[PDB]
Design a binder for this molecule. Sequence first.
Ligand code: 2CF
Ligand code: MG
Ligand code: MG
Length: 492
Amino acid sequence: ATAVVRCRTRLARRVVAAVGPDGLLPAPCESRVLESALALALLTEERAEADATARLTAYLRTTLRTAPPDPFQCAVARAVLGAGTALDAGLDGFDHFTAGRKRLMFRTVLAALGATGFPAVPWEAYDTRPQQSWLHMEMKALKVLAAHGTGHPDVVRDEDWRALLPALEPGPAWECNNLAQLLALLALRHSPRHRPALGDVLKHVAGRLRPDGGMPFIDGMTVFTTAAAGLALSLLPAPPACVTPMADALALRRNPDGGYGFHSGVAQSDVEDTCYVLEFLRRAAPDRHRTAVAEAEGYLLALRNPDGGFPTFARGTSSEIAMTAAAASALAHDPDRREEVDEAVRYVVRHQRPDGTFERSWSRNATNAVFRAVLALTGVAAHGEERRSRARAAERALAHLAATQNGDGGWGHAEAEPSDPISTAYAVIALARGPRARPGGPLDRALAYLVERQHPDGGYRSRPDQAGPRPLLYDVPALADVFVLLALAHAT
Ligand SMILES: CC(C)=CCC/C(C)=C/CC/C(C)=C(\F)COP(=O)(O)OP(=O)(O)O
Ligand SMILES: [Mg+2]
Ligand SMILES: [Mg+2]
């Protein structure tokens, strides 16, 4: 068969072999400068864990020497190893509804580490609506830090301290979020009422160091990765048998609200994880997991905003394009919810930008939202005026992909970035919904790119695309193989 099919096959054997007997594809997260710096600062002011703080220091210097991250994280590392131009630079026109909260978050962090002055804002600026559980704790921690850092500790209300109590529980980070626990602990250490519980958690934070001496942003993304892998495998001509244990492992980890978190032990459900599990289960076990499917469908239908879109975590927060398209695709299978599906799709078409693109949210490349939108625009059957409206929106999106394709056949994070396999995989999934591949065509060139970039061990090593907190990148290496396999499975 073709070189693409041969590439697909080798990659699928690799992905299958990585699924564990428990039905999960391990997806650990790499060390990140930001959390290693916060961990270095915490352990250093508490004068604890000399061994671990020595490693964290060597990791920070080496990473800055050999693999510098964005200017914000560099300023954070430089601030702890020892800058307002770094905020302007890290958020270079960060186009997103969170930009205001982020400018506050990131400046308060830098100030907490002694790199700049705290923001001259009313204390209410740190007040955030109920959303993901970790955001509320993070804003409360930064409010505390700002109150002690500026010399006004009497400003801290007892409802602020209360929000940090999960950080003092033993074991792994609450919600698997290291940044959130490290921020809470940096605030908690200023409270004598809470220092008794602090020694125990410093020993478990210190034991989280990865072999390279760094601290990961999160524990991992095994649910997100397993679901994505299972969905890719179930789109092969003949799916491997292991999709059944994978589906079982996902379904038994669902949260009380019927949604799914990104990792084992994450109580916060989100729309992105839920849609991948739902799409996957509907193909590999619609009957064996009928109930899980129906509960996940009910979860999404409860998050839905009145404007037709879907948020990531909690209704009432801004709808997002990628999430709205993802939900429309996952909800389309049942004809009971065609009203909600069409309204979601219409939301997608209204927010398409004049150049045919959509948004940069949880992925730092434009192709991610393009591929979500194109699937919804072309997967949800329509007729008459609507079919023509959606086909036009899909054409403009695929055309934007063709306009920005690089000579080597791939796409980068942005139009003038060098190609990377993940950004290209997203593009391929979308292009696979356009016209059939012709020689020299955009999709044809994209497949060849993926073929050439395959590693002798059958896998892919790609620049990461995941953001969190946005726009900060974090690296889950296992996602590369999965998303490329997802692309090759749609395209072949
Ligand atoms: C799983 C995917 C790909 C989509 C849904 C969102 C999730 C679970 C992302 C990955 C896991 C975490 C903790 C974040 F990136 C979230 O980080 P934050 O809540 O600090 O991000 P801001 O809201 O501050 O931008
Ligand atoms: Mg955040
Ligand atoms: Mg976070």
